[PDB]
Symmetry: D2
Subunit: 393 residues, 4 copies
């Protein structure tokens, strides 16, 4: 199980560079030089790297420092071949953003947040990124009277449509990906799930270049089925990027390695990315990005190991999910369970609503108790899946 650029494993600079400070303690690891991260990631088989403007350029950086940091960084990229598929903005660590960027109650802040974002789009554009990620981490509240919620969504729309309008105006080849999160750091975050993300998109003047960046753990924090969520994003064709990691339950964002959380769920996420839908449909073709944090208990050896464990986990799952769908016994079980059957339209070609209600056989004379006798055999189909996952069959 050896990854290759062709695999499109991307990693966030803030991921391997996470030095370990959490809400109850300080960093356990020294800062990571961006040039080193670039080079280690290229020796591991990474395809690209992503970052937040302030991951690379300090908030207070002078112009001379900015040009230098970027010289060093492009030099590393040049030298190693890594791509920069996604760039994002940090609208959350500086105290100024304590109430959000786009949806801060303070107009002056909303303004700086949008400016900071427009500048970052130029940068994203220079770096050759295809995706522009928005994570509205400080957008929300701890109390229900803190905000006029209709005004918070108007404000969100203004910021996103302004960013998108500008992409169109500058002719950049960028798509905006919204990344939902239910809570943390705010008690309640706006656009908390994939569903809320897709909904909002549809209210946008420029929603056509706006899509989603679901994160495994974020969905699991609301106890939702991450495979079901991304399938909704796919079906609507708004799956522009994905963030893979592991979560063990409803609690703080753990950001474990992909597959170190809910494993069967990881299995079916891989089946979906790789194999697609059993009856066919859109397939995801973007970068497979890992947004995790090397546990603070581990030193730097652990850090490259966890980077490596991401890609292995994906590759192992990939192998199992291909075996799985390729097993003849699994294809038969599927057919039995009606998986292919769900793909057949309900109505007959040119059958109307009226046509159906008066069809006796479909209703009036339909024998409901006999139909109810079908053994769907979903347990056995489940068992086969598990046996493929365990490398048992």
């Amino acid at each position: 199980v050896q990854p290759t650029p062709a695999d499109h494993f991307t990693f966030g600079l803030w991921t391997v560079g996470w030095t370990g400070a959490d809400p109850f303690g300080v960093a356990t690891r020294k800062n990571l030089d961006p040039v080193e991260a670039v080079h280690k990631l290229a020796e591991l088989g990474a395809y690209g790297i992503t970052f937040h403007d302030n991951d690379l350029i300090p908030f207070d950086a002078t112009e001379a420092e900015r040009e230098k940091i970027l010289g060093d960084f492009n030099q590393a990229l040049k030298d190693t071949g890594l791509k920069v598929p996604m760039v994002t903005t940090n609208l959350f660590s500086h105290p100024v953003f304590k109430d959000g960027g786009f949806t801060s109650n303070d107009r002056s802040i909303r303004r700086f947040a949008l400016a900071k974002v427009l500048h970052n789009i130029d940068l994203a554009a220079e770096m050759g990124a295809e995706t522009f990620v928005m994570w509205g981490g400080r957008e929300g509240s701890e109390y229900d009277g803190s905000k006029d919620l209709a005004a918070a969504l108007d404000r969100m729309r203004e910021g996103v449509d302004t960013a998108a309008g500008y992409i169109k105006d500058k002719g950049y080849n960028l798509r905006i990906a919204l990344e939902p999160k239910p809570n943390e750091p705010r008690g309640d975050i706006f656009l908390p799930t994939v569903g809320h993300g897709l909904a909002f998109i549809e209210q946008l003047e420029h929603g056509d270049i706006v899509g989603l960046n679901p994160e495994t753990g974020h969905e699991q924090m609301a106890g939702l089925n991450f495979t079901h969520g991304i399938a909704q994003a796919l079906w609507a064709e708004k799956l522009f990027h994905i963030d893979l990691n592991g979560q063990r339950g409803i609690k703080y964002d753990q950001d474990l390695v992909f597959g170190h959380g809910d494993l069967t769920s990881a299995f079916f996420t891989v089946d979906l990315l790789e194999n697609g839908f059993p009856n066919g449909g859109p397939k995801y073709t973007g970068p497979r990005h890992f947004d995790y944090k090397p546990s603070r208990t581990d030193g730097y050896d652990g850090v490259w190991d966890s980077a490596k464990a991401n890609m292995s986990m994906y590759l192992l799952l990939k192998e199992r999910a291909l075996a799985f769908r390729a097993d003849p016994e699994v294809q038969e079980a599927m057919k039995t369970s009606g998986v292919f059957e769900l793909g057949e339209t309900t109505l007959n070609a040119g059958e109307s609503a009226a046509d159906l209600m008066n069809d006796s056989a479909s209703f009036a004379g339909f024998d409901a108790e006999a139909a109810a006798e079908r053994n769907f055999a979903f347990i056995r189909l489940n068992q086969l899946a598990i046996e493929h996952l365990l490398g048992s069959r």
Copy 2:
């Protein structure tokens, strides 16, 4: 605190009629005659009643039984004046629906489910209902390989667009309201939240007459903020109906009386329905429906008491939320916290993206550390709210 028809309290027939069987035990209460429910609800101050086709008409009812039951039922309505604002379909108790109605894997079932629904629309139409509710309770799975998820959403769309197409064709004055639920009775339900509900709607040929029926408890089962969810439904203008009840955490659907769960949340839901958005916007004007279950521990006295407790709770909360927004000290705190400020557009009239990025003051010379000094005072605004709720001020 005495309700009046003018209040628009509606109750589901299955609510006061819930006889008490849960997954670990049998009914503790005798069946409720629909005629009695109609009359008790009218003596309590209810404005209307709602039902599922099989709440009133048995699955196996003969035609002669159907006409009788409806004679008795319309007689009660006639006599007491109650309205029938909403009607819904039972696509979940018969074994035939063990895998869903609309999204069952078995084509014959999908067909019967849609027929059963089309017939129910005629009925909804005869009863004078304005809203047609769809609760896809058996739509989902316990295992991730049971379903082709893109095919499950195509199937869902077919069923909903077919129902809606038919409303348009028959000229009925009905709107379809989708009711999301994250889980129970299935391990995972499709369209699990308000967000997923709104998203899907936008993929519909006839989404224009399709909206949402959020339920307090359903949203709280995924740990989401029910006030924030309905505010998104409002903002998108898709809040067609609401179901009020109480939930004490992430667990099975408790369906407690409204306000017997998360009370502050109940408080802010009422503030929102009644008072609207602090900066203005759409307001909800539909029935205030209670979909709860009188605890199985209580006999029939408890049953009318719990019906009555719904309406009292709403009225008490209403009183507190009007006092609250009317307090001058609260309006001042709000202004301080920037609630009205969030309502001011970010950009200046005819200011472009480009105009903003080069405005020095908004970015380049913006003093971020000084702005960050603002005391938002959301804690105090929270305290005032609570003190109004407790009838302290």
Copy 3:
């Protein structure tokens, strides 16, 4: 991966016999005869069968009816060789137990719930059961004011200590195992987790013969780590029986097959039951009882598939857990991470608190910054367990 009676797999009659009635629908399968249940399980390789009094003898049965039922049932056990390792009482289905058995606010229901238990200890002794399980499924409340919380525990203590003393008096060779559950059917059940169960036993007069019956799904309904919980029970020498199944999140009790829930957790569960502790310590040698429900979407073929599946899952993870611990690479990784080191006392033999305080090398002159550099290499250690689980190593 062919089970055999020394595997000690047992199944409850209520599991395979569950006909599918959930709170939103009717049973989807025909009742199962118990004689057929014994024959069918013996043949699958089960070692024993468990039951609740009313699983076998109807609540309403007459004495002769009771005697006719046990005669066919006893014959069947003889014909098959199945044992009856554990017996339990139904103190939750009948309407009378609507507020509980032992903790019911009505004193005459309490006396009745306790006489139902006593009579059942006599049948238990008669069957050869070693463990008598108590699940206080209706013991709790939906509202905080419904109970005097100190009295409920006194009433609970009273019922369990009366049953225990009864055991000692008759000289039955039986132990009582309490089964914790945090909610469902009550909004709050008393003794909601393993901890609460363990603590409570320490306040009993006859605690010596009272221990616990943890269940996978149950602790997972409070988002707890099942392996950490059963570990504490064992450490305390209170793990008298165990119920194994699958739960996919904090939601209603799912009762999926063991391994169809949280897969990595099931693996570590099998590692502690089969292999025990790395530094040596207690071991559980009781039955591996499966407390699950065969999915209602499936017919009888899925019922026996499901029973097979529980035994398979356990046997697969069992080989992987043995390969895993046997692996010398794993043994070195555990060695690096300090798994063995934790087994070493903190204090040296005969060292006193004062000695340690007063030891400059342990505090005063301790290099804490140096010590912080240790790479615990927990991530790699995790990656090795997962590769072993995926049958990759």
Copy 4:
């Protein structure tokens, strides 16, 4: 609703002093001097202040530095009259405690964590503290294989029993209180709830002087009923201290002010701490300690508002809880529901298990169907508590 020193409200230095650094951002407020903290709290009506060794004395401080700090601090206590009821140790912030203090896989960190505690018991005695709190915040794991679960408990037992014996040896008049937490910062903390805490104490050599320090937010992070948990601690005579705050759901530790979380639960919490049990029994007379964090969106005015708010919330709910129990309508409702009846033993004086079994009126000739008709009227009883809470009665 003006607090006074006999209200026994205490506050931790770390609470008001929290400057706002969360995992996604930097502190938003300037550090608070402890001298200023004492002066400011004494003035608000607090009775006492608590702290963690490193809250006052820096980890790095020199002896003279330690002495200079305690001198100003001790002066301040004198000038104000504030007491120091509880003291605790920081075994979580510094990088060395990355795998725990007492349960760290590294033996030399364990010895260091235990000497840090011993030295702190000496400062505790010196301050006049009666309670020494232990929060094992880093004691646990992110992966199941990281620890030998039996050894971790042995190491935990060892550290707590060494500290206890130390206490007894020196004759300090102090008790140890353990504070359970289910997760954060670890994916799984050991002794995750009140139950686990209580059970564990029973296995100690010096358990007699060891009890618990439950915290609202903490049990709520496992979705438990805080009133049912503190009730069990009290029943066991193990409720030695308490931390009060607010949590709005299963998510990260929010530390909102008491009452800004689950309002109905706070009310019943105040009813058990203030009024005790309806049939009489134990009472808690220790301090009402507030373990919260002032929201980072707010400046120092919100810090002191927030401190005021904790004391107000408690005092408001306190009057409502007294009015509520005093109400003769409530006393009759409780009487109907059986609250008092539960206080009655099940068995008659001198009745034996055999007597009861053998009593035809308690089992054989018991009308269970009749008994099932009782209207426990739990809903109405709930509605009365809520009207009292809304200051409506």
